[PDB]
Design an enzyme around this catalytic site. Structure first.
Site, PDB file in Angstrom:
ATOM      1  N   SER A   1      45.737 110.990   9.630  1.00 14.11           N
ATOM      2  CA  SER A   1      44.972 111.991  10.167  1.00 14.11           C
ATOM      3  C   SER A   1      43.664 111.923  10.064  1.00 14.11           C
ATOM      4  O   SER A   1      42.638 111.868  11.011  1.00 14.11           O
ATOM      5  CB  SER A   1      44.757 113.254   9.534  1.00 14.11           C
TER       6      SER A   1
HETATM    7  C1  LIG Z   1      47.594 114.034   8.691  1.00 14.47           C
HETATM    8  O1  LIG Z   1      47.007 113.611   8.299  1.00 14.47           O
HETATM    9  C2  LIG Z   1      47.860 114.926   8.779  1.00 14.47           C
HETATM   10  N1  LIG Z   1      49.241 114.807   7.989  1.00 14.47           N
HETATM   11  C3  LIG Z   1      50.452 115.179   8.312  1.00 14.47           C
HETATM   12  O2  LIG Z   1      50.858 115.106   8.973  1.00 14.47           O
HETATM   13  C4  LIG Z   1      51.093 114.657   6.908  1.00 14.47           C
HETATM   14  C5  LIG Z   1      52.816 114.232   7.550  1.00 14.47           C
HETATM   15  O3  LIG Z   1      52.821 113.378   8.574  1.00 14.47           O
HETATM   16  O4  LIG Z   1      53.660 115.660   7.629  1.00 14.47           O
HETATM   17  C6  LIG Z   1      50.912 116.131   5.710  1.00 14.47           C
HETATM   18  C7  LIG Z   1      51.489 117.436   6.283  1.00 14.47           C
HETATM   19  C8  LIG Z   1      51.237 117.602   4.153  1.00 14.47           C
HETATM   20  S1  LIG Z   1      51.141 116.001   3.376  1.00 14.47           S
HETATM   21  C9  LIG Z   1      51.174 115.172   4.698  1.00 14.47           C
HETATM   22  C10 LIG Z   1      47.213 116.336   9.296  1.00 14.47           C
HETATM   23  N2  LIG Z   1      46.057 116.113   7.960  1.00 14.47           N
HETATM   24  C11 LIG Z   1      46.300 116.180   6.740  1.00 14.47           C
HETATM   25  C12 LIG Z   1      44.805 116.140   5.997  1.00 14.47           C
HETATM   26  O5  LIG Z   1      44.081 116.564   6.309  1.00 14.47           O
HETATM   27  O6  LIG Z   1      44.812 115.788   4.304  1.00 14.47           O
HETATM   28  C13 LIG Z   1      46.784 117.549   6.399  1.00 14.47           C
HETATM   29  C14 LIG Z   1      47.829 117.205   4.654  1.00 14.47           C
HETATM   30  C15 LIG Z   1      46.210 118.642   6.039  1.00 14.47           C
HETATM   31  S2  LIG Z   1      47.739 117.474   8.043  1.00 14.47           S
END
Ligand SMILES: *C(=O)[C@@H](NC(=O)[C@H](C(=O)O)c1ccsc1)[C@@H]1N[C@@H](C(=O)O)C(C)(C)S1
Ligand SMILES: [Ca+2]
EC number: 3.4.16.4
Length: 502
Positions: free
Chosen positions: A245
């Site tokens: 992200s």
């Molecule tokens: C971005 O990094 C995004 N991450 C995810 O979507 C991960 C995945 O690919 O499923 C994930 C979701 C839960 S743990 C890893 C979003 N941004 C992250 C962040 O800002 O730290 C999030 C965990 C809020 S989801």
């Protein structure tokens, strides 16, 4: 009977300093002892005293000489201190000769090991700035004529044909005061989270200077005996990852530049998932319907950025990430430096378009990410990266329009400051800006990227931590507080005036 021969006068290696002249790598006089074996062989009653002085078993020492009796040169030991080379010379053993050599000392040791690097047995660059500026630091060996007898004995000291040319001083962009802080806080963060590795890069957004680069694990480059390959890796420059992200701000710059989106525009992200053939785009929090573009960044909605990506096209997003240096050459000329990869398509299928938008299927390094964030913070102008002090800044390239870069900067200050955002990244006394990530490599990579002060950016910073093993693993919980702690110190050490004023 009498043969003229030539011996090499080894050169002083150049002083490396930090940007303020703090010594980081200093050439120290050592003594290599050599023996002429065919000569040793007429003073055998001295061998036991020599063996014992060199800490050698008497028979192992004697078999060695007796083996190489026909030779005229064997090393006894390379790189003793002068006080122990001299103590051996003091026994006056016929055919034992000494060479004043150089070996590096690193006064800051493990704090700046990866960036400064390491020299091999011959005092040549092997890692980091030692390998990169090896030609600048190395100088050139001298050359000396010696009259030799038919036994391999030095008859005379004739006349040096060439002089040793000493290597030149190099001032790094690194600020040892910020490096120490970055080292300490990243180490505390690793142990606190029980993580496997981490990297933290601090950059000057105006000059392209790397002010700090640290990794865990690290090593003491003064401890030459137990080099473990793992702990010697400059992770910041050689260990690639999916930035997740933390690339959304680039997807958003593509959107704002398209002419199709403004920050007050709305995306429906209900019900927190989106099916795309057999792939499901999934939001962590799924109690949203209408989100503004700023909200999509604050809540980090994958669906939200994916929908914007379907509207503007992957090409516009690829071109932003390309222009800011993601998976592109850094120009830094560190050998073994990995460039990662930015996938390209003639036709972008829907699945690849969405994952690009939220940072999957590309591989970058922490230095690339910090450099993209520096180009965003410096009004969309990318200044060329530098690991050495910049007195005359080169011309930057405009890679994002200044108005778009300014608008995304504001959205990133709300990501840090707004209700529901990454409050742990807040730098007390300052406006801070940036974006959390968390990538599935169940084990995770915890990312925070940003810059400060928001009102007039000076520093960009990336914090990456691999496999935190406590219950909190989100980048916002694990990396944000590190970025906060190091940012408070770095700005104060730079006498940057606090900007959270009326
Ligand atoms: C971005 O990094 C995004 N991450 C995810 O979507 C991960 C995945 O690919 O499923 C994930 C979701 C839960 S743990 C890893 C979003 N941004 C992250 C962040 O800002 O730290 C999030 C965990 C809020 S989801
Ligand atoms: Ca500005």
């Amino acid at each position: 009977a009498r043969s003229v021969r030539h011996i090499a006068i080894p050169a002083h290696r150049g002083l490396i300093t930090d940007r303020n002249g703090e010594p980081l790598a200093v050439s120290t006089p050592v003594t290599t002892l050599w023996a002429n074996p065919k000569e040793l062989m007429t003073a055998k009653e001295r061998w036991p005293q020599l063996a014992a002085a060199l800490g050698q078993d008497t028979k192992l020492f004697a078999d060695r000489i007796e083996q190489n009796a026909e030779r005229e040169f064997i090393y006894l030991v390379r790189g003793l201190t002068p006080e122990q080379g001299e103590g051996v010379i003091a026994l006056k053993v016929p055919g034992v000769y000494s060479i004043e050599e150089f070996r590096r000392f690193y006064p800051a040791g493990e704090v700046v090991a990866h960036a400064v690097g390491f020299t091999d047995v011959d005092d040549r660059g092997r890692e980091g700035i030692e390998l990169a500026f090896d030609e600048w630091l190395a100088g050139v060996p001298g050359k000396r004529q010696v009259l030799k007898d038919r036994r391999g004995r030095v008859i005379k000291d004739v006349q040096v044909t060439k002089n040793a040319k000493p290597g030149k001083t190099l001032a790094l962009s690194i600020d040892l005061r910020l490096q120490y802080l970055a080292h300490r806080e990243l180490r505390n963060a690793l142990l606190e989270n029980g993580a496997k590795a981490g990297s933290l890069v601090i950059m000057d957004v105006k000059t392209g200077e790397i002010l700090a680069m640290t990794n865990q694990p690290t090593y003491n480059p003064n401890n030459r005996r137990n080099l473990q390959p793992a702990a010697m890796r400059n992770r910041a420059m050689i260990d690639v990852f999916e930035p997740g992200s933390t690339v959304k701000p680039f997807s958003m710059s593509a959107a704002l530049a398209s002419g199709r989106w403004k920050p007050s525009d709305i995306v429906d992200v209900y019900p927190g998932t989106l099916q795309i053939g057999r792939y499901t785009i999934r939001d962590v929090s799924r109690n949203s319907r209408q989100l503004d573009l700023t909200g999509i960044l604050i809540k980090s909605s994958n669906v939200g950025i994916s929908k914007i990506a379907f509207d503007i096209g992957a090409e516009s997003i690829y071109s932003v990430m390309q222009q800011v240096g993601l998976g592109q050459d850094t120009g830094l000329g560190f050998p073994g430096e990995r460039v990662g990869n930015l996938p390209n398509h003639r036709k972008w299928p829907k699945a690849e378009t969405a994952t690009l938008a939220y940072g999957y299927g590309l591989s970058v390094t922490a230095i690339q990410l910090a450099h993209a964030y520096a180009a965003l913070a410096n009004d969309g102008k990318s200044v060329p990266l530098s690991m050495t002090r910049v007195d005359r800044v080169p011309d930057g390239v405009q890679v994002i329009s200044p108005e778009v870069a300014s608008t995304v900067q504001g959205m990133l200050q709300q990501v840090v400051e707004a209700q529901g955002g990454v409050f742990r990244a807040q730098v007390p006394g300052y406006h801070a800006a940036g974006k959390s990530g968390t990538a599935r490599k169940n084990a995770y990579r915890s990312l925070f990227a940003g810059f400060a002060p928001a009102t007039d950016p000076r520093i960009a910073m990336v914090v990456v931590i691999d496999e935190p093993s406590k219950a909190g693993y989100f980048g916002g919980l694990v990396s944000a507080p590190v970025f906060s702690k190091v940012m408070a110190g770095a700005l104060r050490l730079m006498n940057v005036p606090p900007d959270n004023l009326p």
